[PDB]
RNA sequence: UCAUCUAGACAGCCGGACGGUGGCCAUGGAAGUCGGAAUCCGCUAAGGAGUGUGUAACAACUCACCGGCCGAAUGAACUAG
């Protein structure tokens, strides 16, 4: 859906042999708290020997964007499962916030590789603080000095089923 | 004689271009394009008309001849 | 007037070259054999200068030949046609002498360089009691003066 | 005998070509893929067989 | 990958004048005039300083930016064809039967006729496209020269004359007979 | 690696400019490596010959521009195939040797820079 | 995933592409190019004890390397929609 980012902090259940476990923390892009906690336990079952019955979640907090009106370039490292194997990819997206960047990332992977939400693993997402570290041409195209371009062929959708003059596509 | 072309200029999108919000919650106010996200969407701001600073798809605004 | 150069194992085709110069093959061979005095045992470049009557034979200096000669070699019949792999002592003085003998002929870049090139020429020869030929040439500055 | 230069000029159009191994198409001599759809633009090409 | 702006340039010499309404190009020079419809290719033209014209495409795909350099080459070919002209020299190649080429007139249409190509009784006639002048050149044996403004018309007429002399049911690596284009250049080459 | 080799070139050039007051710019066309090698040997004692990519050289001179400002005048002359001769001998003797050697069917000295002064010669 | 890149990259033209040295065995010969091993120096801006054509062996031509013009990304191998 429209994604939100949460921090989820959890731990193992405390025993007498070891009280105070190590309080692992992860950042999850998810639609809501339930999906966020499910993905948290999914990745902790991939990492450490723990499961939901043997552990607990001590905190979940929404992390909204610090500057939601700054235009950033993000580099995203992703695992995905194809029909024959597992691959790593690095894609970079020029967008205004992290949740919108990963939303366009999920759309991009589903469009160009037919990869689903169950197949995509988000390794990391990070803002590229400096230009000329941008490595893709499709985003390096929009970083030029005095960028301007026209929008040819305007199509205006009509409300009536009949129009009384030939329309114009000037913009 | 001299060479003649038909120029055919139209309404470039760049910073400082004044746009009119076509549909949405503003829906009829003016804004100024602050920056260009990509080919299809831009970051605008309309601070006199009460339009909050936001990223918006270019299909939801109409570009005006004002710069 | 005409100079012809051939690589000849000593003690000895030649005739084909000789016919153009109208010189007897046997006479040329005898002259070459005498010149091979330098070594004969091994192949060496021989320069024949033709005066339009007779050809004079001299042995032009060659790095491989000089190096092979320097390595002490028991005379080989070559009927065996054995590999005859050449093993040699360091012979640092001989190589320096060889570099001096070259005397930067054909413009060797430096006196030290001429020696280094001479060392490289010993691809065939071991050229050292315990080392790869010219391996230590970069390491040691000794003998630079000797080559000059 | 034609002439040597004129044989060269005629052989430029008739003999200095390549042949697709799949669909026998006569192709440019420096080509990498066949221009035909029916072989699927394959890169199995051979030189056209000369005389002599 | 949707290149948002790609752009080529064409240089306009002192003698020519180029008129571009919507996508119809008219080039007028010393040797005459030429025109071209380009409403199928969807580019935009812009005169800079009366000797430079930029052609551009915005938000174009790979095929579209290929077509941009194609249309630049076409209009530049038109400009250099109305300035210098275009001249194709072709040579006659035969083994035994000499090829006898003349110019005839069925209903005033300037046909080029080809006789005795490999000794046949059939007479091959190729029509001549307008604007193309054909001269049977002296001082070089068996050479024909086609000149004009349009590279399309000149090279197509030369190609029709080449294709009309194809050999059937024989090994064509041995039967090399025909009429082949040997030189392509300008009428005022090395100007 | 590539940069390292390049860095060495920049350094040697700077040293050469400092070492010799007299600079000869020589243009080489159709000169064989063997032809070049012979010239180098003849002039080994009194002259230094340097060959390099022009793009590389121009940047170096601009980099070393603050010191040795007069060398800036040499930059217009650098265009085209060029070689640099650094020599103790003031002028004609070096020039005579370069032109004469290895003329076959051809080294030419395009310009001479000595002591901040440029001579067409 | 490797490499090259405004200190000038990849295409296209143009120039050089050298000495020790005909490196060592082996052959009637094989000198970079029938093979077996080694495969190193000098001069370098740069040039392999050779990429092919190439001759009985040469000679000759071309390469991969460096240079002028060009001024900005490109080459190889692989993966999957
Ligand atoms: Zn095919």
Swiss-Prot record, chain A:
> Keywords for this entry?
Cytoplasm, Isopeptide bond, Phosphoprotein, Ribonucleoprotein, Ribosomal protein, Ubl conjugation
Please give the InterPro entries that the UniProt record associates with this protein. Ribosomal_eL20, Ribosomal_eL20_dom, Ribosomal_eL20_eukaryotes
Q: Key word Nucleotide-binding present in the record? A: no
The protein's location, in the record's own words, is:
Cytoplasm
Q: Which GO terms describe its molecular function?
A: structural constituent of ribosome
Record-annotated disulphide pairs = none
Record Pfam families: Ribosomal_L18A
Listed GO cellular component terms? cytosol; cytosolic large ribosomal subunit
User: Which residue positions does Phosphoserine occur at?
Assistant: 31
Q: Some GO term, biological process aspect, for this entry: which one? A: cytoplasmic translation
Q: Where is this cross-link: Glycyl lysine isopeptide (Lys-Gly) (interchain with G-Cter in ubiquitin)?
A: 124, 130, 148
Q: In UniProt terms, what function does this protein have? A: Component of the ribosome, a large ribonucleoprotein complex responsible for the synthesis of proteins in the cell. The small ribosomal subunit (SSU) binds messenger RNAs (mRNAs) and translates the encoded message by selecting cognate aminoacyl-transfer RNA (tRNA) molecules. The large subunit (LSU) contains the ribosomal catalytic site termed the peptidyl transferase center (PTC), which catalyzes the formation of peptide bonds, thereby polymerizing the amino acids delivered by tRNAs into a polypeptide chain.
The record's similarity note reads: Belongs to the eukaryotic ribosomal protein eL20 family.
What additional remark is attached to this entry? Present with 54300 molecules/cell in log phase SD medium. There are 2 genes for eL20 in yeast.
| Protein name, as recorded | Large ribosomal subunit protein eL20A
Which species expresses this protein natively?
Answer: Saccharomyces cerevisiae (strain ATCC 204508 / S288c)
From Swiss-Prot, chain B:
Q: How is it modified after translation?
A: N-terminally acetylated by acetyltransferase NatA.
Q: Which domain of life is it from?
A: Eukaryota
Compartment(s): Cytoplasm
Q: What is its main location?
A: cytoplasm
Kindly list the GO CC terms recorded for this protein.
cytosol; cytosolic large ribosomal subunit; nucleolus
Keyword vocabulary terms for this entry = Acetylation, Cytoplasm, Ribonucleoprotein, Ribosomal protein
Single GO BP term: ribosomal large subunit assembly
Q: Which GO terms describe its molecular function?
A: RNA binding; structural constituent of ribosome
Q: Indicate the quaternary assembly.
A: Component of the large ribosomal subunit (LSU). Mature yeast ribosomes consist of a small (40S) and a large (60S) subunit. The 40S small subunit contains 1 molecule of ribosomal RNA (18S rRNA) and 33 different proteins (encoded by 57 genes). The large 60S subunit contains 3 rRNA molecules (25S, 5.8S and 5S rRNA) and 46 different proteins (encoded by 81 genes).
Q: What else is known?
A: Present with 45300 molecules/cell in log phase SD medium.
Q: Which family does it belong to?
A: Belongs to the eukaryotic ribosomal protein eL14 family.
The name of this protein is Large ribosomal subunit protein eL14A
Gene source species: Saccharomyces cerevisiae (strain ATCC 204508 / S288c)
Curated annotation (Swiss-Prot), chain E:
Keyword Acetylation annotated: no
Reading the lineage from the top rank, the first entry is: Eukaryota
Signal peptide, first to last residue: none
Molecular function (GO) terms for this protein are: rRNA binding; structural constituent of ribosome
Q: Which SUPFAM superfamilies match?
A: Ribosomal protein L6
Name the UniProt key words of this record, in alphabetical order: Cytoplasm, Ribonucleoprotein, Ribosomal protein
Localisation: Cytoplasm
For this record, the Gene Ontology CC terms, alphabetical, are: cytosol; cytosolic large ribosomal subunit
Q: List the disulfide bonds.
A: none
Which parts pass through the membrane?
none
What PROSITE patterns does this protein map onto?
Answer: RIBOSOMAL_L6_2
Mind listing the GO biological process terms from this record?
A: cytoplasmic translation
Q: Which PANTHER family match?
A: 60S RIBOSOMAL PROTEIN L9 (PTHR11655:SF16), 60S/50S RIBOSOMAL PROTEIN L6/L9 (PTHR11655)
Quaternary state and interactors: Component of the large ribosomal subunit (LSU). Mature yeast ribosomes consist of a small (40S) and a large (60S) subunit. The 40S small subunit contains 1 molecule of ribosomal RNA (18S rRNA) and 33 different proteins (encoded by 57 genes). The large 60S subunit contains 3 rRNA molecules (25S, 5.8S and 5S rRNA) and 46 different proteins (encoded by 81 genes). uL6 lines the binding pocket for eukaryotic elongation factor 2 (eEF2).
What is stated as this protein's family in its record? Belongs to the universal ribosomal protein uL6 family.
Additional remarks: Present with 52400 molecules/cell in log phase SD medium. There are 2 genes for uL6 in yeast.
Name of the protein described by the UniProt record: Large ribosomal subunit protein uL6A
- Organism field: Saccharomyces cerevisiae (strain ATCC 204508 / S288c)
Gene of origin?
A: RPL9A
Swiss-Prot record, chain F:
Keyword Chloroplast recorded: no
Query: Which residues are annotated with the PTM Phosphoserine?
Result: 66
UniProt main location, coarse: cytoplasm
Does the keyword section mention Phosphoprotein?
yes
One biological process term from GO is: ribosomal large subunit assembly
Record's GO cellular component terms = 90S preribosome; cytoplasm; cytosolic large ribosomal subunit
MF term (GO), any: large ribosomal subunit rRNA binding
Sorted alphabetically, the keyword list is:
Cytoplasm, Isopeptide bond, Phosphoprotein, Ribonucleoprotein, Ribosomal protein, Ubl conjugation
- Cross-link Glycyl lysine isopeptide (Lys-Gly) (interchain with G-Cter in ubiquitin) lies at 12, 95
* Protein localization: Cytoplasm
Summarize the subunit comment. Component of the large ribosomal subunit (LSU). Mature yeast ribosomes consist of a small (40S) and a large (60S) subunit. The 40S small subunit contains 1 molecule of ribosomal RNA (18S rRNA) and 33 different proteins (encoded by 57 genes). The large 60S subunit contains 3 rRNA molecules (25S, 5.8S and 5S rRNA) and 46 different proteins (encoded by 81 genes). The 5 acidic ribosomal P-proteins form the stalk structure of the 60S subunit. They are organized as a pentameric complex in which uL10/P0 interacts with 2 heterodimers, P1A-P2B and P1B-P2A. uL10 directly interacts with 28S rRNA.
Q: Which family does it belong to?
A: Belongs to the universal ribosomal protein uL10 family.
Identification of the protein by name: Large ribosomal subunit protein uL10
Specify the species.
Answer: Saccharomyces cerevisiae (strain ATCC 204508 / S288c) (Baker's yeast)
- First-to-last residue of the parent protein present: 3 to 199 of 312
């Amino acid at each position: 859906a429209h994604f939100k980012e949460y921090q989820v902090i959890g731990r193992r259940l405390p025993t007498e042999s070891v009280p105070e476990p190590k309080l692992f923390r992860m950042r999850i892009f998810a639609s809501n708290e339930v999906i966020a906690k499910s993905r948290y336990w999914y990745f902790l079952q991939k990492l450490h020997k723990v499961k939901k019955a043997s552990g607990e979640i001590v905190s979940i907090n929404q992390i909204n964007e610090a500057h939601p009106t700054k235009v950033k370039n993000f580099g995203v490292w992703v695992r995905y499962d194809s029909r024959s194997g597992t691959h790593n990819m690095y894609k970079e997206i020029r967008d205004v916030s992290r949740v919108a960047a990963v939303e366009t990332l999920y759309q991009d992977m589903a469009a160009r590789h037919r990869a689903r939400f169950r197949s995509i693993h988000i390794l990391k997402v990070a803002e590229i603080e400096k230009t000329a570290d941008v490595k893709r041409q499709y985003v390096k195209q929009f970083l030029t000095k005095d960028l301007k371009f026209p929008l040819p062929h305007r199509v205006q959708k009509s409300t009536k089923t009949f129009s009384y003059k030939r329309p114009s596509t000037f913009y | 004689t001299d060479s003649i072309v038909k120029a055919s200029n139209w309404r470039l999108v760049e910073v400082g271009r004044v746009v009119l919000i076509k549909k949405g919650q503003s829906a009829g106010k003016l804004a100024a394009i602050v920056e260009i996200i990509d080919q299809k969407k831009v970051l605008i701001d309309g601070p006199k008309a009460g339009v909050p600073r936001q990223a918006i798809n270019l299909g939801q605004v109409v570009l005006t001849p004002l710069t | 007037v005409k100079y012809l150069y051939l690589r000849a194992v000593g003690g000895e085709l030649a005739p084909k070259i000789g016919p153009l110069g109208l010189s007897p093959k046997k006479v040329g061979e005898d002259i070459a054999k005498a010149t091979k005095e330098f070594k004969g045992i091994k192949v060496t470049v021989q320069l024949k200068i033709q005066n339009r009557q007779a050809a004079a034979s001299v042995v032009p200096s060659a790095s491989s030949l000089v190096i092979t000669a320097l390595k002490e070699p028991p005379r080989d019949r070559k009927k065996d046609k054995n590999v005859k792999h050449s093993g040699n002592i360091q012979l640092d003085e001989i190589i320096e002498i060889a570099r001096q003998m070259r005397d930067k002929s054909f413009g060797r870049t430096l006196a030290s360089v001429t020696k280094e090139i001479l060392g490289t020429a010993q691809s065939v020869g071991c050229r050292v009691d315990f080392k790869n030929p010219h391996d230590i040439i970069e390491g040691i500055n000794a003998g630079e003066i000797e080559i000059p | 005998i034609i002439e040597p230069s004129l044989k060269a000029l005629a052989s430029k159009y008739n003999c200095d070509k390549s042949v697709c191994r799949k669909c026998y198409a006569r192709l440019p001599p420096r080509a990498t893929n066949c221009r035909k759809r029916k072989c699927g633009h394959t890169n199995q090409l051979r030189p056209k067989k000369k005389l002599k | 990958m949707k290149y948002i702006q790609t752009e080529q340039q064409i240089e306009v010499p002192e003698g020519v004048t180029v008129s571009i309404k919507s996508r119809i190009v008219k080039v007028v020079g010393p040797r005459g005039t030429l025109t071209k419809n380009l409403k199928h290719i969807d580019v935009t033209f812009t005169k800079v300083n009366n000797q430079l014209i930029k052609v551009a495409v915005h938000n174009g795909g790979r095929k579209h930016v290929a077509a941009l350099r194609t249309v630049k080459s076409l209009v530049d070919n038109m400009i250099t064809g109305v300035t210098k002209g275009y001249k194709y020299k072709m040579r006659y190649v035969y083994a035994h039967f000499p090829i006898n080429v003349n110019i005839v007139e069925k209903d005033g249409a300037k046909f080029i006729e080809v006789r005795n190509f490999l000794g046949d009784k059939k007479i091959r006639n190729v029509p001549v496209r307008d604007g193309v002048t054909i001269e049977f050149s002296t001082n070089v044996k068996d050479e024909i020269v086609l000149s004009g403004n349009s590279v399309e018309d000149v090279s197509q007429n030369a190609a029709d004359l080449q294709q009309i002399c194809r050999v059937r049911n024989k090994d064509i690596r041995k039967f090399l007979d025909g009429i082949y284009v040997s030189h392509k250049g300008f009428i005022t080459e090395d100007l | 690696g590539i940069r390292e080799k390049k860095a060495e070139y920049f350094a040697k050039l700077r040293e050469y400019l400092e070492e010799y007051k007299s600079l000869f710019v020589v243009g080489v066309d159709n000169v064989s490596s063997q032809q070049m090698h012979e010239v180098r040997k003849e002039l080994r004692g009194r002259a230094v010959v340097l060959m390099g990519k022009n793009t590389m050289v121009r940047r170096a001179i601009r980099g070393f521009l603050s010191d040795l400002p007069d060398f800036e005048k040499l930059l217009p002359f650098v265009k085209g195939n060029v070689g640099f001769v650094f020599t103790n001998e003031p002028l004609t003797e070096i020039k005579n040797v370069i032109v004469s050697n290895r003329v076959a069917a051809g080294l030419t000295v395009v310009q001479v820079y000595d002591n901040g002064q440029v001579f067409p010669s």
